[PDB]
Each structure stands twice: as C-alpha cells, then as structure tokens.
Amino acid sequence: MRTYTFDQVEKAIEQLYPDFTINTIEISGEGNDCIAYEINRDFIFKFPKHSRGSTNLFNEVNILKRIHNKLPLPIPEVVFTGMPSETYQMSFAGFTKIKGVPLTPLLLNNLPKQSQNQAAKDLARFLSELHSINISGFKSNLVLDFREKINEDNKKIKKLLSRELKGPQMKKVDDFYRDILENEIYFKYYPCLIHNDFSSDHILFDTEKNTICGIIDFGDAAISDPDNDFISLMEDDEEYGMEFVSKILNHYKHKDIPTVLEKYRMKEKYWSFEKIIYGKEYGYMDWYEEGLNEIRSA
Numbered sequence: 117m118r119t120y121t122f123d124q125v126e127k128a129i130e131q132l133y134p135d136f137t138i139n140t141i142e143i144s145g146e147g148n149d150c151i152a153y154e155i156n157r158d159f160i161f162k163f164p165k166h167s168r169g170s171t172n173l174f175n176e177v178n179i180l181k182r183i184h185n186k187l188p189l190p191i192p193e194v195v196f197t198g199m200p201s202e203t204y205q206m207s208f209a210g211f212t213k214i215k216g217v218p219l220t221p222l223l224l225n226n227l228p229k230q231s232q233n234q235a236a237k238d239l240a241r242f243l244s245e246l247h248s249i250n251i252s253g254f255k256s257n258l259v260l261d262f263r264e265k266i267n268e269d270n271k272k273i274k275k276l277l278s279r280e281l282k283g284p285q286m287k288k289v290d291d292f293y294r295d296i297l298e299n300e301i302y303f304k305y306y307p308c309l310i311h312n313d314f315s316s317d318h319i320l321f322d323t324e325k326n327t328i329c330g331i332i333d334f335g336d337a338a339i340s341d342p343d344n345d346f347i348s349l350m351e352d353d354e355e356y357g358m359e360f361v362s363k364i365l366n367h368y369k370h371k372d373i374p375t376v377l378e379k380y381r382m383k384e385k386y387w388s389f390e391k392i393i394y395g396k397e398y399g400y401m402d403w404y405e406e407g408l409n410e411i412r413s414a
C-alpha cells in the first residue's frame with residue numbers, strides 16, 4: 117500500500133509530459149486499486165496503490181482503447197499514460213474528467229418515474245451494446261471462465277483455511293463448492309465483453325438533464341457471463357434492487373430472467389468466500405477476518 121504526495125504525482129507526470137503544466141491538484145477519490153487525483157479540475161489521474169491495482173489499471177487502459185467509440189454513453193477517455201517497472205505494469209493513467217455525480221439508489225428513487233424509466237432504458241442499451249461488441253480481436257487472457265474460477269477458489273479456500281477451520285466445518289465448505297459446481301446454470305453462458313463491476317457508484321448522472329452521462333471504472337472488465345452486469349445492480353442495500361433491474365432486463369430483451377435471479381442468489385451466498393479470497397489478494401485483513409467469522413457460523 118503505496119501512498120503519494122502531490123509532489124511525487126507532479127514529478128511522475130512531468131517526466132513523461134513535460135509540456136503539460138499542472139496548475140491545480142487534489143485527491144478526487146480512492147478505491148481498492150488506485151487513488152485518483154483531480155489535476156487542473158479537468159482530468160482524473162489514477163495512481164496504483166499496489167502492483168495488483170496497477171495491473172487493474174493497465175487492463176482498464178487497454179480495454180478503453182478498444183471500445184472508445186463503440187458505446188451509447190461516455191466512458192473514460194485515456195489522455196496520459198505512465199510506464200511499466202519491476203513493480204507496476206503502469207505507473208499512472210490520466211483520463212478526461214466526466215462531469216456528473218453517481219446515480220445512487222437514493223437519487224434514482226427520488227427521480228420522476230419517467231426519468232427512472234429512461235435510466236433503466238439507457239442502462240439496458242449500454243449493456244446490450246457492450247455485450248454485443250465483437251470480441252474476436254481481443255486478448256484471450258481477458259476470458260474469465262466462471263467454472264475455472266470457482267474451482268480455483270475452492271482450492272484457495274482449502275489452502276487458506278485448512279488450519280483455521282475444524283474438519284467438519286471444512287467438509288461443509290467442500291459441500292458448498294461441490295453443490296455450486298454440479299449446477300450447470302452458473303457456467304453455461306455465451307461469453308462476451310462485460311464491465312464486471314457494473315454498480316451504482318460507476319454510473320454517473322447529470323442532475324440538470326436527469327439523465328445518465330457516463331459509465332466509469334473499467335478495471336475489472338473481462339470476457340465472461342453478461343449476467344454479471346445485472347446481478348451487480350440487484351443488491352437492495354448498496355444497489356438498485358429487483359424492481360428496477362427487471363426494467364433493465366425487459367429493455368435488454370433478457371430471455372431467462374429466473375436464471376439471473378438464481379445467479380444473484382448464489383453470488384449473495386458466495387460473498388463470505390469472496391471476502392476471504394479478495395481480502396488476501398487485495399491485502400484487506402478485515403474483509404478476510406469477517407468472512408472467516410461468517411463461515412464459522414455457516
């Protein structure tokens with residue numbers, strides 16, 4: 117977990133962009149992978165906090181260059197790039213700022229119905245076009261096969277928790293994985309390009325027009341199940357809930373809604389294990405401790 121000063125930020129940019137004068141700078145945001153700085157109040161510069169987050173950022177830059185004029189909404193436009201080292205695949209990236217605020221569930225629910233419905237329509241169109249992008253050209257590395265992922269997660273959890281769980285608890289963990297892996301519905305899909313972190317904090321909104329004006333944070337994008345981009349919005353607490361996503365599904369012409377509901381339900385059940393595994397890979401020990409404690413009360 118690297119941190120940066122404004123000076124280190126400026127120096128790093130100046131080396132590669134000497135003719136770009138920096139007038140203003142301040143932290144605009146911070147995620148699990150990068151800190152973001154607002155330079156000149158007209159450009160968002162992401163710096164990785166660790167190597168994994170830099171690989172994320174490298175992925176983001178590379179996907180955005182392939183899809184930059186293929187979508188019905190604005191997306192982050194890469195303007196500045198950093199360099200690789202032995203530690204980071206990309207030392208930083210600078211993007212054009214997209215004005216707007218996140219379309220939070222609270223904001224969405226306070227909109228006139230007609231504007232809510234237009235938001236579901238515009239999200240559907242964006243997903244339908246995104247999931248229809250021809251991926252024949254793309255890197256095969258981007259393919260995230262869900263059956264391989266779940267099998268690998270089972271092995272990681274065994275590896276992580278072998279000495280933390282009593283034998284009968286570990287058997288029950290093994291049962292859970294074995295059960296998930298015998299259900300074909302989770303692993304039979306037609307892979308396409310997916311945003312893969314398609315949640316409300318990555319949907320920007322223009323409160324003057326009451327319309328969606330951007331989709332951001334493509335660092336998790338990959339070629340996997342397109343249903344991923346609906347289930348990320350179905351959570352009642354931090355996301356839009358079932359009523360609204362069912363509007364999105366209807367505009368998208370989804371043919372198998374009860375499968376999306378089944379995938380959401382399993383994902384919800386899977387969260388304790390995602391916290392254990394993501395906790396360790398992204399070095400968040402509280403995520404890891406909380407999931408481990410959920411499992412001991414399974």
Ligand SMILES: NC[C@H]1O[C@H](O[C@H]2[C@H](O)[C@@H](O[C@H]3O[C@H](CO)[C@@H](O)[C@H](N)[C@H]3O)[C@H](N)C[C@@H]2N)[C@H](N)C[C@@H]1O
Binds near residue numbers: 353
């Ligand atoms: N905070 C508690 C919630 O955390 C997760 O969702 C949240 C995800 O954690 C958020 O995603 C973030 O965390 C995930 C890992 O969970 C990373 O893969 C992703 N790059 C990062 O942006 C995502 N963008 C929003 C979503 N509601 C759980 N899926 C649901 C849980 O209620």
Ligand SMILES: [Cl-]
Binds near residue numbers: 237
């Ligand atoms: Cl319509």
